Design a protein around this ligand. Sequence first.
Ligand SMILES: CO[C@H]1[C@H](O)[C@@H](O)[C@@H](O[C@H]2[C@H](O[C@@H]3CO[C@@H](O)[C@H](O)[C@H]3O)OC[C@@H](O)[C@@H]2O)O[C@@H]1C(=O)O
Ligand SMILES: CO[C@H]1[C@H](O)[C@@H](O)[C@@H](O[C@H]2[C@H](O[C@@H]3CO[C@@H](O)[C@H](O)[C@H]3O)OC[C@@H](O)[C@@H]2O)O[C@@H]1C(=O)O
Lengths: 671, 671
Amino acid sequence: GYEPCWLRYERKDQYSRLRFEEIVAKRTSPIFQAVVEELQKGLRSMMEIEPQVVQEVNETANSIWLGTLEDEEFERPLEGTLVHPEGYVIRSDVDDGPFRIYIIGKTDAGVLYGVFHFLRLLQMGENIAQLSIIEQPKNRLRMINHWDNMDGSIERGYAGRSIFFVDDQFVKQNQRIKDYARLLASVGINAISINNVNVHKTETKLITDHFLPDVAEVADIFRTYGIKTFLSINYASPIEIGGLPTADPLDPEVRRWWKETAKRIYQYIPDFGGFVVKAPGPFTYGRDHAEGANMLAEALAPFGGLVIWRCFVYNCQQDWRDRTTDRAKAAYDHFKPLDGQFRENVILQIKNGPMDFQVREPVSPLFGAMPKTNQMMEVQITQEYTGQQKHLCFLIPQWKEVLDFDTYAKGKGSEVKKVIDGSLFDYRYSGIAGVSNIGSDPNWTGHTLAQANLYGFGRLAWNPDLSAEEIANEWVVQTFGDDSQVVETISWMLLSSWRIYENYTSPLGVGWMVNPGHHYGPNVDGYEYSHWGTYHYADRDGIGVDRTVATGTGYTAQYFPENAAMYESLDTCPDELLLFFHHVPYTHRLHSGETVIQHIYNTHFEGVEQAKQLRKRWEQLKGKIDEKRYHDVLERLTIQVEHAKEWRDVINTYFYRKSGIDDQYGRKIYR
Amino acid sequence: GYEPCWLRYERKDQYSRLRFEEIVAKRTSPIFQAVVEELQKGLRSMMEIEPQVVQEVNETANSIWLGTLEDEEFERPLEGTLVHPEGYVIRSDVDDGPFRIYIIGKTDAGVLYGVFHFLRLLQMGENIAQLSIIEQPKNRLRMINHWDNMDGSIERGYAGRSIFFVDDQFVKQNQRIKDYARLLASVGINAISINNVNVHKTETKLITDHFLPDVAEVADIFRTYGIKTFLSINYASPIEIGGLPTADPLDPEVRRWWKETAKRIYQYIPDFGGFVVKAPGPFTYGRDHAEGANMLAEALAPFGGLVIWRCFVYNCQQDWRDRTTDRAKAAYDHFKPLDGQFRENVILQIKNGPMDFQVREPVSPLFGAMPKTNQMMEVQITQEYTGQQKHLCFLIPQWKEVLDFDTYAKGKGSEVKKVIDGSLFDYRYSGIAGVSNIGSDPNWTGHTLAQANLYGFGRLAWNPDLSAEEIANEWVVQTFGDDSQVVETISWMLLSSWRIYENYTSPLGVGWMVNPGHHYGPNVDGYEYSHWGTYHYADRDGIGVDRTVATGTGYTAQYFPENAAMYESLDTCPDELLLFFHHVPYTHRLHSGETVIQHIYNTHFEGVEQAKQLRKRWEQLKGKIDEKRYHDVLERLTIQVEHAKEWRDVINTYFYRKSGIDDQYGRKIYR
Ligand SMILES: CO[C@H]1[C@H](O)[C@@H](O)[C@@H](O[C@H]2[C@H](O[C@@H]3CO[C@@H](O)[C@H](O)[C@H]3O)OC[C@@H](O)[C@@H]2O)O[C@@H]1C(=O)O
Ligand SMILES: CO[C@H]1[C@H](O)[C@@H](O)[C@@H](O[C@H]2[C@H](O[C@@H]3CO[C@@H](O)[C@H](O)[C@H]3O)OC[C@@H](O)[C@@H]2O)O[C@@H]1C(=O)O
């Protein structure tokens, strides 16, 4: 009913197989059961072998050994260096007897990730004769956030309906949930919130006895795949379902209500992860976010639960007339002052940028500014402002730019990745979360190639140091095979896609210029006079938001001195973010040599030609990809080309109508 | 539970009463029963008298005689000139004996309208000692179109939920429907379509046995008040509920299906009015609208039913790049060529303007262009683009401008009103329809003063020659009393409201500039790059749609020579419609002496000050209006003032940003 995505386990030819007679499973836990089944599935499908599962090594059999450090009958130096619970070592026995592969994890979860790594090597056709691998994830929390609603809809979902809910109830078919867990575990994802951060009427009841049995059934599946389950909660629950007159976090009964709620949840789900919170709320009663988050943290504390508090807070009622108020400054001004006031099990979840997942946004100043408060970054896998899976947009390159951004919080070498992996400030709980891009569609992600974004998110979550090139390579090979043309072509498409999409959408980092509401397609003035604080200020002479300290909102001062100075200066501010930081004349000359207005025309005309090239390159792969997927993607690429033409012309015409400056190259701009 | 609107029948003082002992009802029909009950209600409430209802005149009693020409025991000359079925005569007996008032109608409906006229005179405090009145409606069809959905919502409804439906069923409480019928009948409305022209899933079933009993129950109520019931239909019904493979109007079985459907409906509702149609459809099968409308007309013909075919047809997928395509020309180019091909019981329903109920639009060229096809005009009482009942907007003055527009179809004296009343071309069926502005709100229309629009629609439908001044006077007196200050103040507010709203919204007839979707509030470029064909083409030098023959779309040629020439010339084109017909520089000098850009600034700054005056004048009436209604309206007036400020600033800033020309008077324009 649906695709296996990157876990194809395609049958190998007669010259690429392995000889194994047994799988030695040293443990019988639920996770080990799933681990063994996955190994059996992979070996059967790829190698056409069915090794017997045993609990003790056969001295003369070729085997794959699965176990933890305590199960070892010696313990070599390599695995001895393992300190992370989810870490593992994979090594081939150096002796000259039977062939033995040892997958040693610090804990059961480690064995799971180790087996998926082993299977990845097999799918990639790597030589496993002399393996010596040690892997430990950099981020403690590698999470997925679902924006699924219980009526089946998914907020900002472009890949079909929810696979969890339908008709305000849980789906009765859990097989797809198991396969989803397999996909998530294959890339190391260890945490998931199953419901929309915008908690509506029915969803508010997920923390009650009426739905907890179903939530537990789902959590049971995820647990076997090393994934902790979380629920997004309605801060007003005490009122809506608690029967209390207030939701004030300082009200004695409200505090008690949440403690009892936590206790109730843990009776159903002993290892419940905690709550994801989008915040009647704290401010409603004059309380700050520390007071609001700490109350929930205290309820979960005795049970080891975590409170994931989203920092996506700003004035959703800003006056477009007031150029002194800057939405981009909101998150930092709200949370920076609260550093050191949060309980230890509270993690502030901050979007990669200070605005709202635009094609390009500078890094949120909050990263590196709160040494005493756990932080985790939230990225959006679903392409809300990046093509909505109609346009191709491999998000990994962008995420790496964010992760590798040096905040200089503690001098050079204070990259965002070091902030969220917890090494820079010694955070007890930290990591990264991604807004799911899946749905009921057979190909899971709407656009077949968007499967690469989910896979890629997991890879970066595990190790931010992985290159975009190798992640793309891994995904393409596992999903489409090793034909050099197929690999090179699809890898190029993925690696080039983000820049291509940015080229014909919003210019030089100013963002937006999208249709209000659904957010798909060009509409330069869409939110220009709205109350959302998302303005470009384009007029007949220039464009851009002055965020400088010298003459603007002073947003640049939120960064540490090194980056603040870079953006503050009109001369040093990078072209790609120029309009986010400075208001400049259309004739302003960029580092590229292009005037701002000509840059707009250039990238929009040229971006469409690049999109046409994406389609052309794909068409050249006909015959090397199964017809179904070939046409599924071709269909989307054609949709992309046609819509790109709309983006190009709408933006070019809008700016020609305002600037009065013609295209240097005389290309077609409709009057 | 709800207000009586203009049928207050307020108790008179001791010096303004009438002496009547009997009501002589010569007939016992359902309509006569309602007529008598209404007279009893009015006299009891206003005069505190309860005359006995009899069937024969008492030679010595003061009486009110109700009957038709055949019931007369002589028949005087005046009533002898009555030719219209709904006409009536009201006259006081000239003898010196008992006081007698004769209300003589051509038919029962005539007696109903005559009684409501008599009651109107009493509410207005007119001297009825020597009455000699003769009235005949100008328009045969005086209809109301409901955009109500069966789930309770009302498309473009700003006065609450449907009073007809809820939960995909009919409401069980019909008392409000009776009071609504009373209101409609009081102003002569004789036809109504109860469901949205956009017929959805459940609504498509209104023409089936499952809902017909309920439809009939509603029709029964309206019948007693002289109102014919109509249903909007889904042209694809044969497929959706008929089980047929097509909806092609030329398919033999489709034609038969509709005939059987008509027969079925008439078994439940013997005097069913017919179908209102918004058109799978005719074009889907390569058929024209004559073929499509005639098929339905043939089904209803044997039963005397009518087909009301909406001419709101255009390319809802127009390319904004193509300046040769003009949505304004669509209706005429589509229907003009079909003149003479429609069945006699088909009436083409055309909006007052060629676009879509904007604050100001020139008259639809179709009026006066189809001598051989019945036509009726559709106006919108619900304020979709005129304030949505948040802003005050008495629509009567605008409708009179349309009705009095001389098309010169047959030389001078070919006003739109003569086209739709059927006198110019001898149309068998014609008239006017208005999109209802009512909802479940206690005050029926959301804005208390919007009650004047429904009342006013009925008055104009009855006699387009009535002045806006007298209609406003009638409504105010009946609804708020005769205090000279109250009357003068509210009348001024109503009469000035439309111009005030236009002043701060779209300029010089170009229209739109509203938020997409809900259509409320400023957004200059809202639909500027959309596929709806609603563009203003504003750039850094000028604004406007070139609809001239010389250099534009050639739309002016759709009018007859006299009007075509007026609009074609930049020098003679009226200021109020300039931007709808010409694209001009911001510096273009208007007949008023204002440059186009300064006119924009002037009306927007000044319109807000005028709105503040509306509120000020209302506040001065405190103490002379019951507190509930005083505050209900004050609340709305304050909302209007605050939103007007937004309209003013958004438009002024947009044009300053594009034109670069400052306000002549140095008023505040946000950069
Ligand atoms: C699940 O929450 C997220 C939103 O989907 C997302 O677009 C974003 O918020 C947008 C905003 O979205 C509107 C939110 O209110 C709704 O009633 C409306 O339908 C949406 O269109 O659109 C304007 C933009 O400036 C905001 O950033 O943020 C969400 C989040 O909570 O991260
Ligand atoms: C009941 O029909 C009418 C519409 O409510 C009204 O606004 C108008 O059509 C508008 C158009 O409305 C959209 C119609 O499609 C819907 O899916 C969408 O939600 C509405 O916003 O908005 C653009 C404007 O150019 C059109 O004129 O006409 C209606 C009618 O049938 O008279």
